[PDB]
Amino acid sequence: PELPLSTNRAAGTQYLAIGAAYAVAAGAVAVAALQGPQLLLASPAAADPWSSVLLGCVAATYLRAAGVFLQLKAASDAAELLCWRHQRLALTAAAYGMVAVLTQAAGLASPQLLGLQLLLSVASAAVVANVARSAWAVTVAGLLLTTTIVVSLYGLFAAVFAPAPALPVAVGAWPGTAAAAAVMDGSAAGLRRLAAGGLLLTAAASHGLFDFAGSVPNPTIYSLLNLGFVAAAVLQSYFLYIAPAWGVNVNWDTALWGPMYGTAFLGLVYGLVALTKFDWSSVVDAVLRVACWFAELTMWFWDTFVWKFSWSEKTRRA
Amino acid sequence: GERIWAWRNRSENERWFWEVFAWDRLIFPILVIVAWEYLVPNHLVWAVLAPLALLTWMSGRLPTPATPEFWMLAYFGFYRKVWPDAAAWLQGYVVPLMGFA
Amino acid sequence: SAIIKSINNKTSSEKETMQLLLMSSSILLHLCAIISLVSI
């Protein structure tokens, strides 16, 4: 019960088409974060720079998602969605859309959110159901990715289980206008769920890459998604690196910018792990180098200021 | 004399233990490491780095995780002299970078 | 006497342990000093 060429080309068109749609969507939300956040909304409180910053972060996660779909295609060259790891990654791509519709069921902030991600995720859901019925009928890199797994899944478990935090009232701050002494809006809960969904998609992407390249089947194909896994991440940080310039406050809230900076810096650090190629025995060699240097320092200190090595050690021949 | 002969033939292991092993390779190294770590202020150059150099110079071999010396040094020195502070250091300097504060 | 009085007074068979510890420490100190000297 292998995969005949018909199923192969069908899954190829499926993955390539939805991944190209994801890439076009990523470019579109990129230029959205470029000009304005209310491009995708209708609520009045979308005149805020942090909305456009999170918009750019969902654009980077959509870049990652288009990369995930194109590497689905890249694995679809050798008909390689029958390995149990690929099956689990298809199941996690299903749970991605499932928890996305769950998060919008907990609250939906934009009709454009509905349109966009229902299009993508329900397409993915029908696709993954059919391909599951098809398949059923037959070093510091690891630490990096598994830590990104843990951190992103905890960000999800703390972001999709709580309704919302509360912004401090700042007692006596212009009791009239200036949005002070108010509640958080229905224009940011959906923003939080979109951030959480992007964090989950990149979490499942990292889990897939980790349990795939654990042999570090394709050892070199991920070089494509390598791009998607790192560049945007760094770009992510760039957004947050301009966040204090825009004056957006990231220190007060917990479930929004924590995993933001965490996963962004971790993506830059994976760029490092691929940049200098720590052998997992080279940092141990640096440990040994500094230990040998300090040993040579203390031996000199001893023989000079404490007790002469010619005195302490026994001499022979007489 | 006959009793001493029979008793010497049945207790060779215990004899070698008490004459060669009890102090030199069981009690003295324990005492020496605990004594050194009782003195010697709670830094890293004194609690871990110089102990290793002096232990390799004295015993003539480096303490690896295969030996009891490495584990005694690790536990006493590291865990009870530098860890209760480097823990706060990492909890205030490196964990903010990652997701959870 | 003030010495032994102090270590008896400040710190179930504990005073005997402290006194044995003191005497052993003192004898060992003198012996270590002499051996370290004649090691030159």
């Binding site: 302490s312 050690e313 | 390779r25 004594a35 004295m58 | 270590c32």
Partner: peptide, 24 residues
């Protein structure tokens, strides 16, 4: 293939003894 046991610490020198009275 050895055992889990210490080594001698005094086949080379004697200075280690200086540590027992002091701590005492």
């Amino acid at each position: 293939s050895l055992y889990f046991v210490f080594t001698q610490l005094n086949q080379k020198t004697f200075l280690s003894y200086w540590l027992l009275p002091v701590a005492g």
